[PDB]
Amino acid sequence: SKGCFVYKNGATRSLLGKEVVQQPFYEEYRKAWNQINDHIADLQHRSYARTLEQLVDFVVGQAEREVLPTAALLTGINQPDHLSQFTALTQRLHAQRAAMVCVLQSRDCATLKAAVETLVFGLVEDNAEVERLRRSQCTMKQLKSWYTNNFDSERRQLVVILPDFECFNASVLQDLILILSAHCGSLPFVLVLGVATAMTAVHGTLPYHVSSKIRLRVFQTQAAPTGLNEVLDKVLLSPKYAFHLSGKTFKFLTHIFLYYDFSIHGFIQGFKYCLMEHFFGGNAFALCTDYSKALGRIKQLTHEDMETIRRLPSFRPYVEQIIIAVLTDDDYLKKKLPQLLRDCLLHFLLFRCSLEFLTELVGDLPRCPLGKLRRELYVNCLNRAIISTPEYKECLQMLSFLSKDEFVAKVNRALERTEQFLVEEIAPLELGEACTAVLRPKLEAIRLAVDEVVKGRALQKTLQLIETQIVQDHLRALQDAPPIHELFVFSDIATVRRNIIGAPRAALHTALNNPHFYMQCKCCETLPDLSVVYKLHLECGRMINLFDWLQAFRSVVPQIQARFTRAVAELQFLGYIKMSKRKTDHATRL
Amino acid sequence: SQIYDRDSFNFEIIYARFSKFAKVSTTMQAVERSIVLKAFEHLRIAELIMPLTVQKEFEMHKLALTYSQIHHCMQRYQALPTEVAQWAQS
Amino acid sequence: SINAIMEEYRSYFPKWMCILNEGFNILLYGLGSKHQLLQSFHREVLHKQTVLVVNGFFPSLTIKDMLDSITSDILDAGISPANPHEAVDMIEEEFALIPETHLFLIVHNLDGAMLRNVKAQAILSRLARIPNIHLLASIDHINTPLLWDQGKLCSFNFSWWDCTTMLPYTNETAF
Amino acid sequence: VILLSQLPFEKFYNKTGLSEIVCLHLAQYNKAETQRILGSDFQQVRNQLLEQKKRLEICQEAVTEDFYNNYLNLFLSVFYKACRDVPELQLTARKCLSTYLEPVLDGSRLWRHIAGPLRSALTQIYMRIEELPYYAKFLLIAAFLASHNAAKQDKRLFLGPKSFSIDRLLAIFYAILEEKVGLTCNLLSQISTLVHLNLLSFVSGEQNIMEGSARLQCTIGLEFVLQIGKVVGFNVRQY
Amino acid sequence: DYEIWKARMLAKAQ
DNA sequence: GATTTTATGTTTAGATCTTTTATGCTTGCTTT
DNA sequence: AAAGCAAGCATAAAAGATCTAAACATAAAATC
C-alpha cells in the first residue's frame, strides 16, 4: 500500500567485514589505486593550471577595473570531470579573497524569479560560508543594500558560474544577462559560461541585443582525446606501477573512450574495475607490487595462494621446458619466486624503454602504419608477435628506403630520447639499475652501428641488430611473455565487458531466442510462454490484426487465451509492442 | 508576400530571395549569413515581424505592415542606394 | 534450471559486497522478475543494514516520499524542503558530517511509470552520487537508457550484472 | 512617468484603453551626424594613443583632427550599410584605428592596407570576442538525413527541417553504419547527450521518450555536417 | 585443460 | 518584556477541465 | 500493383482558465 518501505536500524545524525580487509589484497589495491588516482589528479591539475591562473588573473584584472566582463571556458562534452575544476577555482577566489561565487546550474532556473532568488541566495550563503533570509524577500535590491552594507571600505567580485550554458532555456538566460547588465557598475559582476560545444552556440543562442551588451573572452581546457593520450602515456604506461593491462582490455577501454563517450572519468572507472577484478582473486594476486614488498608477501603467503598461483596458464610452459618439492612442498617454489618475479618485472621495464625507443624511431617517419603514439604500438605488440605482422614489414620496407643522413639523425634523436628515459624515470625504481645494465650494451651496439653509418647495405645490419638485441628479447608478445606474468597482466575481457558495457537489448533477445543460453535446459536447446508469442509477432508485420495472430497461437499450441493475453501483457510491459489507440483489440509492433 | 500573396515566410526563404540579389549587387557581396541573421533578429525585436503564435533560423513569420508603408519608406529614406531602388521597382 | 541459476546468483553475493564497497552501484537487467533474488539479498546479508526498499513500479509513488523518507526516518531532521534540488542539497550536507553512517537502497524498477520522467532519474543520479549511500537497482524496460545522458550515467557509477531468471511478472502487473 | 522602448506606442494598447500620453520620437542619425558623434571623442582617443620613442614622435605630429575625420569617412564608407548602431561603431572604430595606424608609424596611401582587414572586421560584427565521438558523428549525420531527406525518399536511398521519431534515426544509423554495432547503453546515452547539448531538440513526446512516440528535430546546417563527413571522410551528398 | 596437464607434469617433473 | 510557537489567513504553484487545433495517423479512394 | 493525396479522426499537446493542495509568513498568545 505504501510506495516506499524503510528498514532503518540505529541511524542517527567500510561495508565489508574483517575477513577481507585483514587480507593483504585490499590494502595493496587501495595503495596502488590511490597512487594512480593521485597521479592522474595532479596531472589534470598541472594541465589545468594555465587556464585556472588565466581565469583568476581575469577576475583580479576585472577587480582592477555598463557592459559586464565574462569569460567562456570551452569545456568538453562530458560534465563531471570539470566540476571539481570549478570548485578549485572558487577556492582560489577564496584564497586571495577578492571574489565570492555562486554556481547557477540550470535546474534552478525554471523562471526569471527563480534565477534571481538562487543568485542572491547563493551569493549571500557563499559569503556566510566564507565566514537564512527569506526566499520571498531576496530581491536584487536587497543584494545591493547588503553589498553596500558590507563591502565598501575595502571591492569583492560577484562571480556566477553557469556550468551548463547549453541546458538553459533561452528566454530566462537572456533576461538574466539583461538584468546583470542593468546592475553592473553598481555591483561588480563577472559571468563565466561553460559552453559544452563551440562558439557558434554562444553567438546563436544570445540575441542581437544580449550579444550587444556582453563582453566575452574564450579560454580552452584541453580536449578529451588529448587528455586520454596524456593519461595513457604518463600513468598507465608509466613504469613505476607494477600492474600492466593486456592489449585486448587496453584497446577496449580506449575504444569506449573514442567511440561512445568522451568520459575521462569513465576511463578511470573502467580502469578501477579492471584493477578490482584482477586484484580480488585472493592474496596471491597481491604479489603484483614493488619488488621488496613483494618479497615480504612472498614470505607471507598461505596455501590457497599457492594453488591460485600454480594453476595460472603461463606457468604451464615453464614446466614444459624442463623440482618435485617445487610442485608440492611449496617452499622450494617460494625460493624460486624471486627469479620469476624479478625476470618478469625486468621484462616489463625493458618492454617500456624498448617501446619508447621504437615509437621514437617510427613516429618521425611519414605514414606510421604501426602508429605515432605509444599505446598503439603497445596494443599491436601485446596482441601478437610484431615480426609476423604485415605492418612491421611495411615499416621496415619504408625504413629501408630512407636517406642515410636523415636515418642517422633520426636514430640519434631516438638515442637522446631513450637516454632521457633512462636517466629520468627508470632510475628511481628498484630493479632499474639491472635493466639499464641489460639494455645499455645493446644501446652501445646500435651506437657503433650509428658511427659506421656516419662512415647502403649497413642499414640491414642495423635492422638485424634491432631485431636481435631489442625486438625479440624485450618486445615480446603476451603469449611470448616470461612465465607467471599472469599475476601482472589482466587478459580477462569477458567479465569486464559483460560488467561494464550493458546490453539490455542483447540480453532480452538472447533470452527470447536461445533460452538454453540462460535457462540451461536439457531439452529446449517445453518452451517458455513468452518465447512463442515473441516468435509469432516477430513473424508478424507492423500492424497486428490480433485475431489472426491469436489463431496462429492457437495453431502452434479457453485457457490458451489466458496464456496468450498474459504473454501480450508481459510483452507490452517490455515495450516490444503497444496496443492500438485508434482501434481496440488490435496491436502494433514497436 | 506580394508574389505568393501574404503567405508566411522564414529566414531561409528570404535568404534565398536576398542571395538572388546579393550575387549581382556588387555592393552587398561582402555580407555573410551572420550579419543578415543579426538584421533578421533585429527586425524581429523592433516588432516589424511577428511570429506565428525550433531553430532561430527557422521560425515561421508574418509581415506587420501594409504595403503603402513600405512604398512610402522607400521614398522618405535618405540616401538609399539606387540598386535597391531598382529592386524596389521590380 | 531456475533453481540452479538462482543459487548461482546467490553465489555472487560477497563479490557484490566488495563491488559495493568501492563506490559502484549494482544494476540488474534481466528478463524475468528480479524481485525474489533482491529480496533474498535483503535477507541474506542485509538483515542489519539500513535498507530503503523502493517499489518504483508503484502507480502513485512520488519522488517526494523518497526524499522525506531519507531525510526523516534515517537522519531524523524533519521534512525536506519543497524543491527536490534543495532537498538533495540538504541530504548532501547532512551526509557530509557523518562518516560510517552507511546505508543502502534497493530500487525495484528504475523504469517505473512515475520515475519515467527525467527529473526523478536526475534526483536518483544526484542521490547515488554521494560517497556514503549505495544503490542496488533493477531494470526491465528495453528503452530505459534513453533518459540517462553521460553526466547522469557517470554519477550513476554502475556495475551492470546480467541477472536473468525466467520469472513471470506478477508484482509488476499487480499494481 | 517617463517610459522608454523601441516599439511605437500603438503596440501598447489594451482592451480597456489608456489615458493621454505625450509621444516623442528620436530619429536615428544620418551618416554625417554619426561621423560628428564619432569625431567628438577625438581628444580622448588622441590622449589614449599618446599612452603607447619614434612612434610617439609620429603620433603627436600626425594624429590630428582632419586625419581622424578622413578615417571616419573611410570607416563609414564601409560599415554604415550594415549597422547604424552608434555604440557598435565606437567599439569597432577604436580597434580598427589601432590596426589602421601602423604604416603611418613607419613610412590616402592607406586605404588598401586597412581595407584588407576591414572586410574581415565586417564579418565579425556584433559578435564580441577579444570534438565529438565517432558514433555521435554518425548519429548527427543520420539526424540531418532524417530531418532533411523527407519521409518518403528514404525507401529508395536505402518548408524547413522536418520533425522525426528516433526509430527513424536508429534505422538510418543502421543503414549508414555498415558495421552494425550492438545497441549498448552508451549509444542511447549518446542520443540523450545530443539532446542535452542542443545538437538535437524536442517538440513533443517528452513524457514518453522511452515509448518511441517522441518527436525530435535535428538542428544543424549543411556546412558543419559536411565538416563531419569530411573528418570521417564519408561523403553525405550521395544521400 | 588442467587435468591432462596435471597428469602429464606430475608424471614428468615428479 | 522578550521569545517561541503555533494557528491561521494568504500566497503560489500545480492540478484539472475546456477547447482548440491540429497534426500524425487511419485508411480509403484514386491514379499512373 | 503500389504510390500518393485526401476525408476524417482520434488522441495529444498547448494554451488557458479556473480551481485546490501545499507552503509559508504573520499575528497572537502562552510562557519564561
Residue numbers in the entry:
A (entry chain C): 8 to 20, 38 to 89, 94 to 159, 177 to 199, 202 to 369, 375 to 507, 562 to 631, 641 to 672, ...
B (entry chain D): 358 to 410, 420 to 456
C (entry chain B): 328 to 502
D (entry chain E): 155 to 206, 211 to 265, 273 to 295, 320 to 347, 375 to 455
E (entry chain F): 224 to 237
Give me lines lifted from the publication on this model:
The loading of ring-shaped, replicative helicases onto DNA constitutes a key event during the initiation of chromosomal DNA replication. In Orc1–5, the AAA+ modules are augmented by a C-terminal HTH domain of the winged-helix (WH) type and co-assemble into a pentameric ring that can exist in both open (active) or closed (autoinhibited) configurations. Structural studies have revealed that the initiator binds DNA in the center of the ORC ring, bending DNA to prepare origins for Mcm2–7 recruitment and loading. To resolve these outstanding questions, we determined cryo-EM structures of DNA-bound Drosophila ORC (DmORC) assemblies in the presence and absence of the co-loader Cdc6.
